């Protein structure tokens, strides 16, 4: 079953990398979004802020970008372990 | 700013339609996912239940669909009023 965010977004806070029991790097971060929905009847500012987090090679991406860049970020949401979590599965510098 | 959910996930249940101020008519409605993330690492299975609503033309649409039923949904996420919302833009039956 399909399960993919698209967002862009800025990058608002990191915390420190901590690791899985089986030595996987996880880097949890908040972004903020900014936009417009065209998608809705009326077109619409949207504005939220979401968890997220990276795993692995995107935990060590993650780890090395300051807060306020701008990221396009694709993944898929997950329960944090209820609220939910977007995984970041693949990112780009926005510009 | 791209803000894009696709998500292919059961209708749990559907609340009685209420109208904004302008008559527009929406309909709240829980999503239930249940698939697989290949997105990550390792494949990894991923279940959670999403908030969701539908305005407009998709209100009604939502307001005829039996609750169980699979649902392919695509749209945008939004601050419920914080919560986050999924707001469908489209929608197809799955099966």
Not at 17 to 35: D, E, F, H, K
Request: charge should be positive; hydrophobic fraction near 45%; include cysteine.
């Amino acid at each position: 079953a399909i399960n993919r965010l698209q967002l862009v977004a800025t990058l608002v806070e990191r915390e420190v990398m901590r690791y899985t029991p089986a030595g996987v790097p996880i880097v949890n971060c908040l972004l903020s979004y900014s936009g417009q929905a065209m998608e809705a009847q009326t077109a619409r500012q949207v504005e939220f802020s979401i968890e997220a987090l990276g795993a692995g090679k995107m935990a060590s991406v993650l780890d090395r970008i300051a807060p306020g860049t701008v990221l396009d970020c694709v993944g898929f949401l997950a329960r944090k372990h209820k609220a939910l979590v977007f995984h970041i599965s693949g990112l780009e510098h926005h510009h």
